[model samples]
Target: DKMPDWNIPSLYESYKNDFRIGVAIPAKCLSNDTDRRMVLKHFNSITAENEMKPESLLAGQTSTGLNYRFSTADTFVDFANTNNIGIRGHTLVWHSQTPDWFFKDSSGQRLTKDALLARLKQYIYDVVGRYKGKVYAWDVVNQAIDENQSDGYRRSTWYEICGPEYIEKAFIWAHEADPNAKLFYNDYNTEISKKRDFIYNMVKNLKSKGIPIHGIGMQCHINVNWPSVSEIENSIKLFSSIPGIEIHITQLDMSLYNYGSSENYSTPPQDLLQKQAQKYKELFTMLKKYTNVVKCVTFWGLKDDYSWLRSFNGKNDWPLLLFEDYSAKPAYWAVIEAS
Candidate 1:
């Protein structure tokens, strides 16, 4: 027994006193015995890696008509429901994954503000209503922060057509669809980058205006070295100050090298993994302090082999809690030991 079997203590159970621990996985992971067993037994929550994105659900049929389909994501939905695993439906409204046709008229003309807003209301009602009781929460709006803009509203199609009011509108529509489920505004760089203060104020404005925005998802997609623990802690404190609003350590993955998230396929130095592990420990330790409003911490992916950082990022990078072979890395243990 000197060598511990991989039946490591469940991170979700260990952190139950503080926050839920979760992982993002592909739907096919259920069919693959190895991944299915590991994730189900360890984590309490699940996020569909890409199966539920707007593009995945709508594909190219939006501009043709307001046709919507949820079949592509049904597998994961069924699995979560059967297993009683919490599912966070990502990105009800995001500039990147949404199809351009959604904003255009049949004649290829852009819809007016009122017209676009009407379509948005319809989308949220249908999508969020589809899984009202199944999904625990939805990232109502994503990456809606733009630092360069005076008001910090991302210059996305939603903003271009409807202005910052679009943020308020997205939350309102989602709340009407499912008032019981948590509604989160998720974005990147809000925890440490220049976007921090702007995003902080944006949340304040939303709450003050009586928008039913329930939570803030700090998309913790960051580097191991940058954004020192104090920096992250400060931003967390800033956002959690809002009454009744919880926070999620969402989109978390760390890299050892200086590779930007979108990197080229390169060999990561195994010699530096210890640093990565310690970083995870530091992150979880800091996050543990906010159990009152910090609801969960979710790693962006399950295995390095399937990480978006690997093939999609300009370069390959290992930015997950597990190695390419599906074994937990030191970072995994660090979370279990997180206090």
Candidate 2:
């Protein structure tokens, strides 16, 4: 595990005045001394990559409603707290990676709407309550607005049982648990007008109804050419217009290859690398301009080799600010120069 190295100013320190830079951290990172060192050096915030998800946190059947085993989550939270790195709870509710039994009954049938809603309420309160003050914010809902669907909303089991109102219901449950901590709705492909409008209107309506939703997290997953800087800025500025609502660039990772390309990407061509760097510069510049509304710009992973793109869409790709060996990529310098 030799790391290519060079000395550069700490990334968190470099941009701390403008906006916090965050990284998604998995449980495996906690045990790796090198990973811990990198996090301490470069990042100012952390979102547990998978440890906080329902799959990791769920404790199987118990005597009560929605039991949880949060030891792994607590380790991440505790590390953040001890070091003063802001912690954003990755999610409270999402359709994927959740346990199968969550929406089922004793007889393996779907729970009634009321029953499912009740369980959800308890689960939100229970998880959010445990980490209350330690966590700075929670992604209360994620990928709820389905871009592929004509109606621009997902019909997960929760949605089927609780209806569209489930979005507001989730915010309410989280707010009840911790009123001070911010609540965010996060999703991918949000720069497109269709999905962006759906999410923006949904939050605007929820806030109008006094649901206590606080922020919108754009999971800025992109490629070098798609979603031009203007498009990205348009999405951010439109959402920022809502009174009291903040914008967070969450789960950001820019790829160099096509999705579903069936290619194992590595050693990017010089032209693509330069394009990636320019995109980073342009995106960060816009974010800095909107610093009044945008709070944090979070990278989806620590480095290119560690990114989720390796397994996603059956394609391997480089998608981050740092290189595979922990050296600063051109994108890193571009972001620094943007500042």
Candidate 3:
């Protein structure tokens, strides 16, 4: 065995005084030697990139209870336990990657509001309850708001059937499952003005009604050029204005390609990589200013090859701290410096 010891700066150790450093990965990553070493050495927390999502967990359901397949999810939980790292339950509720049967009746029609809510409650209880204390936090709801929509709610099956109450109920049911687990409302485009306002209003309204909401998971899938640091800071400030609410920089990755750009790269050019590094620095530096509210920072993936950007944009992209060979990139040093 020729496993090399990583004699380099540790990302988690660099930010140990500030907050937890985390990475999202599939369960199979735990078995890769390089991936395992990188995770164990640099990250203190992990998010099941997809394995913990509803689609992977849910099996079938009876009238009163939901059956779940936990084998995939157990890999993450077991790995986290073995390594003594905090695991964030990716999501209890999301419109995408969820089964159609969740929102449908026995006859293939959409379920009634009461029926959907009943299923939702049992689903959240079973999934969150299974992990319980093993998972440190849970994204109770994901991407439920839409700036384009008049009501600011995404017209998802959950909202279409149960309306806005589904989000409130999700938080409540998750709390009932694991009272100690920190609950977060996770979404993308949180820094956008209109989307930020919608989420702000929703969270404020829910908190006023004494919902068990704990934090905002800013899905910062940003790029090197867009979303000025001021924009991100403004969103953080606005959400932190809510008393007792925390912030988690979830799904953070600095893509080389700007939004709407079709440019492709076989290997990320050094200039673009430098720009990516600067962006990472800018984010970490700004996050340092709000360490009081920002609790954890998780990169969407640990390395460039593991990123979703390639499949998502239909082109090659480097949007993470490490290269495909498990080598540290400029962005890695940038984060180290900022931390």
Candidate 4:
């Protein structure tokens, strides 16, 4: 069988000078010659852990296949050194998908605050230190703030034991581990007022204490229409105004709702898709204008079939990538033209 040459690099080179192109990768995607080459060609940067499994980390090591994590640091250093492709570490600490042992004691109860903090420090030091300089940026803390105003939302295993100090300590440990890599506080719904204010204040407080924070990651996971562009713009400006802070439009996606049974994954209506594409273009256009604040833009996934939103509550929403079934959808051309 012949390997497929996807011309990923060519596509990237077309826009290389304009913006950094990135893709979210699964371990399986890197398992073959064709798949690996295609990924390397198209994306200068890659984020991993489709579901944050322990095995995914090993995939980069043992798999002759495309699993980049096995060789994550090496691959990142190679790509960055060879092609100048920057690497954004998917995460260092996350509330979900973490191993149970991380927070549990031998008796199956949660550890005390000091114990948890010790474990956290070790984990951050080991993971972040391994590829400290190779990875350009680290999602130092992810999804820490709760978008929903539920009680104990931010109180995850890490938070329950350590209090709000966990956040400051995480950044501090990560900084001590990898002083060179840029650190970011990454989350979704930055456009929402309540969540935005919470994060804004937390970051502000942290800065006042002289923390070594670097940037904010706006996880731009927008619906068909919820937060208006003005809201997003304002959120960007608000965060940018923070003294010595930059921003990245990280984990970006747009979705369309189906009329009937939510599970339907049929192609979205033409007008709706066009609107979706226009949203991306306008968002990127706005991001481009903020060259000093905005550094990189990354789509959540490369294809609609693989998007997390598809299986989310069984709601059929065409959220990401400008194409479906390899056909260049209007959103695809819109992004290209706009770029």
Candidate 5:
């Protein structure tokens, strides 16, 4: 049986070595035989974080598991080795989806600032050190800043307890543990000027202080008309200015409106799919110009059926994918044409 050529080579034959493409794998998709291989063959790298079942995380422990287990190191290692894929450790430290005991002390209250930092260091060392050279990159700190604020500083649980210093320490420890893997700070809504400037400035400060931060992951989970092209291009230029820093357009998609009240929030106008395609073309056109600084571009979820937007707040917004259903959406072909 012949399958449509969705492989990187077909879509990006011109820039094969210049950049890489990846897609997020929902656990359910992996269970299907055809979908699993199709996804694996399309991209060279994959992020296997949070794709595991709760039972897998506690694999032989007597204690009842409190947190959902998306994936384990061994499973990821085997999958990567088998498929000849590079894995990006989605995250090692984040405020969400973490073990409850991580923040609480015996007294059942959040630990002191210093205590939390100590635990954070230990966790980073253990997780990053164990996988170390095996994984290509690690999201050392995820969503550290509260974008709604003027200054891009830590706002999540980790930041609240350990302060901004926690971010520096996380990178430092990650480097010490796995000097071979690239470390990145991943965040969303970074295309906005204030938030983008905040991250750029933070990166600048870290570099001046000689921190081990190596890359920035722009969670490009955006709306159709949000984040003007100029803003994204400027962000690329700004982050690329830092020596040794690379960028990833992680978690990208695009969508259109079925109706104003559809489940996905902020849908692209009904007649704007073509405009959306052009938008992607412009963005990728700019991105291709910075091949030296941008390493990978990944869509957060491949199909609208499995997209996170569908489950979020019933607002029905779609603006982060290259395809809709089996047909190659305009955005998908636009990227190919742009490349």
Candidate 6:
């Protein structure tokens, strides 16, 4: 069957009052006719999937100081400005996808804690300061907690060198860089109770210490089967309990696979698509319940072909709401109806 008359009401328009509808966009996708058209018509908020990350922004080291190159991310920022779309800065600090220069010296040894924190402050100031008013919020610190650790903190290079002080300092510098921008701590698998508790305690302690953190970004990279709606809702409920802290459904997309499955699909079965649609509907419906606390719900990407799941898993999969051809999948309509 063909997806005839592929036009409908805008997704953002339907959910505008509840929360901003957003999508993660890579710079190259903007040149794609269908990607640009769909994003402009449907999303109110846009995030740079990779161009705004630490690795992409950090240019090189100079004798004078650290250098930044915003040429790539600048494209997306300018697009957001021209289109009157809000930009969510993907991240200021993360363990992955960051260049080695931030943590190592020219001698290739790890920088001292003071040296690392200084670089971090300078980096945050330059990046966040450049985008200040244009970008509305930032994932100030991403994935700093690990459940397996005794202290529930990831021992990434940042943590190993600076200890937990890096998390606190990152938020403080981010606030100084852009006082108007909302600061967030973002991570994946927040629906897991143990991890959720760890995140909750950490953010709560940060806020108690008067850190500038303002929100929690639950990177809801869930699938159709695992982590039931109640589990997701429970996580939202626990995080929202923190007064003044907003919730963002950042990097959300439901995969076709159930957690343990290694099965591959050239073309996902119709029944699985239906199940994915139902999951999307349920998620949006559940998200609507916390409209007061949840300010934005952002999909990881706009189209199935662009989804990271396919490349990461080395499998053909449809995880997003739009088909490769930009036709609306059942999940798309299901999400709209949820609004």
Residue-level lDDT tens digits of model 2 in 1-339: 557453577777888888898999898888898889889888899999998988788886543666679899999999999998999998889999898798887667788898888888888998999998889989999889987777777988877888887889999999999988999999888778888898888889899989999999999999887888899999988899989899889999888976555455446777888999999999988888998989998899998878988777555567788777778889988988988
lDDT (10s digit) by residue, model 5, range 187-208 = 8878777887888889889978
Per-residue error for 192 in candidate 6, Å, reads: 1.2
User: Among all windows of ten consecutive residues in candidate 3, which has the lowest summed lDDT?
Assistant: 1-10
What TM-score against the true fold does each predicted structure earn?
0.93, 0.96, 0.97, 0.84, 0.85, 0.97
Alpha carbon lDDT at 207, candidate 3: 92
Residues 116-209, model 3: lDDT tens digits: 8988887887788888889888999999999999889999888888878999999999999999999999999987899999999999899988
What's the lDDT of the predicted structure labeled candidate 5? 0.70
lDDT of 6 by residue, 1-339 (tens): 324233687899999889999999888778977678789888999999999999898888864568788888989999999999999998989999998777887666778988888888888989999998989999999999999898899999999898899998999999998899999999998977788999999999999989999999999999989789889999999999988799999999988997768888888889999999999999899999999999999999988889998888888889898888778899989998899
Candidate 4 stretches greater than 4 Å from native: 1-18, 32-38, 51-84, 147-153, 258-265
**Per-residue alpha-carbon lDDT of model 1 for 10-69, expressed as tens digits?**
778898788878899887787887788778877888888888888888744444357766
Off by over 4 Å in 6: 1-6
Q: lDDT for each of the candidates?
A: 0.81, 0.86, 0.90, 0.70, 0.70, 0.90
Q: How does residue 105 of candidate 5 score in lDDT?
A: 69
User: Which of the predicted structures, 5 or 6, would earn the higher lDDT when compared with the native?
Assistant: 6
Question: RMSD in Å for candidate 2, one decimal?
Answer: 1.5
CA lDDT for candidate 3: 0.90
User: When superposed on Cα atoms, how far off is each prediction in RMSD?
Assistant: 2.8, 1.5, 1.7, 5.2, 4.1, 1.5
C-alpha positional error of residue 150 in candidate 3 after TM-score superposition, expressed in Å: 1.4
Error of 3 at 40 (Å): 0.7
lDDT of 2 at 152: 72
